[PDB]
Scaffold this active site. Sequence first.
Site, PDB file in Angstrom:
ATOM      1  N   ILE A  73       0.775  -1.095   0.036  1.00 20.39           N
ATOM      2  CA  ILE A  73       0.129   0.194   0.126  1.00 20.39           C
ATOM      3  C   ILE A  73       0.862   1.142  -0.064  1.00 20.39           C
ATOM      4  CG2 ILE A  73      -2.197  -1.088   1.013  1.00 20.39           C
ATOM      5  CD1 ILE A  73      -1.363  -0.326   3.432  1.00 20.39           C
ATOM      6  N   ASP A  94       6.238  18.926  13.342  1.00 18.22           N
ATOM      7  CA  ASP A  94       6.398  18.709  11.659  1.00 18.22           C
ATOM      8  C   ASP A  94       4.900  18.122  11.325  1.00 18.22           C
ATOM      9  OD1 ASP A  94       7.602  18.498   9.066  1.00 18.22           O
ATOM     10  OD2 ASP A  94       7.859  16.365   9.418  1.00 18.22           O
TER      11      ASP A  94
END
Lengths: 317, 317
Positions: A13, A129
């Site tokens: 994936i 972040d």
Amino acid sequence: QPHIGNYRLLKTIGKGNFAKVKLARHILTGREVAIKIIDKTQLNPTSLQKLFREVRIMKILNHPNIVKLFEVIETEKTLYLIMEYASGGEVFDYLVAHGRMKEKEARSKFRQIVSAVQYCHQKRIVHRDLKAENLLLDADMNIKIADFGFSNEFTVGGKLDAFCGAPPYAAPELFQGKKYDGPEVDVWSLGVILYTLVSGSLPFDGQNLKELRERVLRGKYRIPFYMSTDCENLLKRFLVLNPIKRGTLEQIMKDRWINAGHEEDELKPFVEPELDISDQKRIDIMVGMGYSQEEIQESLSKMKYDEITATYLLLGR
Amino acid sequence: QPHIGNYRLLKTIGKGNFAKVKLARHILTGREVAIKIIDKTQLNPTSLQKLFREVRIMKILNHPNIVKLFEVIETEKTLYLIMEYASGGEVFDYLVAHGRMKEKEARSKFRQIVSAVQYCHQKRIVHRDLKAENLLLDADMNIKIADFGFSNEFTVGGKLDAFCGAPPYAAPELFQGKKYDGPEVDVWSLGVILYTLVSGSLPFDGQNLKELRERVLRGKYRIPFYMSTDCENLLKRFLVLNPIKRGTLEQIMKDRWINAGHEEDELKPFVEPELDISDQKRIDIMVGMGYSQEEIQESLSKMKYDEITATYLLLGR
């Protein structure tokens, strides 16, 4: 390659510079998991030590709204981290597809996000972040926060995810030349997130970094007519230019908007349940699989993240 | 099969938000061109004015290493900009594929890059947004600067990818909260670019915004064993943290490394020659094709960027 350990490997994936992620099925319980596969032979010494520290952090983050590690499998060339699979995609992609959430649904998501992030902060893990890739949804629409305090070097998107996707969520101190490292940075980012849940768009944007910067430093954002006053007032606790004046998550948890409909259930710091390594219904099942009493108690008490502790956890899901 | 004016439309090579780019062949001359196609009906009145301002910019940049505009065709709905095609792709991708350039090759590309950018600055055009996409190579390995001074709104980029490639080339003033609008910014980015040509690598990197920001603000970068002293010294003139002290292009053009092997040929600001619109040999070919001298003289002398001026230019290539 069709199997690793007690897992049958199914669809790839995601594929990144140093890592791949495959969906997989645990053979003993039949549960679906996501396995991150890191090629060790492509890492130098420093990168290798960063990986191990980050694995140690994943082992201590246990919260219903943070992606859970279930097992580690290691060989001389490859590291496999068997993780909770969140099949609902990214929250921001959900917002692009379905538009803004009404305040009731935004509230149930934002309570989960604030709880998960505060819980990290309490253990001294700050992400600095935040970007859309960090906020996932599971099949039941519960929030699952991914890769929090886990370097982009080992993700499918890599550095580009941050450069492409972090500026809209960056705190104004990023463009003011000084530090960028305490929990206050994530608090700004969570204000941006709240704004996206309620409006379906970003409060600060631009066609290039200079324009994005201008808007972030000015700190002004549009309040749509449909946004309640109480939501507007909460946004003011996150989106403060002076990080010293910014609210903390433990304080922001007492906010009126955050607890609407929770008169009897106020949001507060998450407290880990005591870890039950002594459920005999599951131990008996594992004995039936061929593990011994003594092996089970040792792997659980030393919390080895091995075949046994993963089976015990997955039997509990 | 499909055509627009004098152009057979070939494959689509870029697909952006407001703009597509198609390769095409000029049927009178057989020359290949790249056609930017903008659908006007999707723009509002102000960005439409923006587009036209930006067309007027392309019309006065005429340098051998800046993508040249050949023709404009405009219909009720659509704007077609017939541009020079640079088939060699982005310089950073060439360096990734082929490794660093030897100093002599790096010097020939860099002299082109510096001449083109100083020429823009002289006409008061500053980009402040340099990215890898801006620097392309033609079939003969000559540099062709693309999209310089133009908004990301009209490039292929793709909407939500505007911040991806800028941080590695951004000047430290972005992160210090300082003015970000002068030619000094692009000077810092050209130091980044020199470094990539000679090393094959970026000088400032990080796995997220915080780490990149911290390398840029600190200003220190690795010098590989193979880099000459003269190249290291030239780098020090671009990669200066303080934007007032940072060297200017007109001063830098005098540098020892810039000019090695160019004794009788010191790099200096570009002076555009007078366009020879009186080549009777080309004029005769065009009369053969059906144009008249009189009208040829009108379109050229008024530089109308119509089918005549494009044919005259393409015949000289």
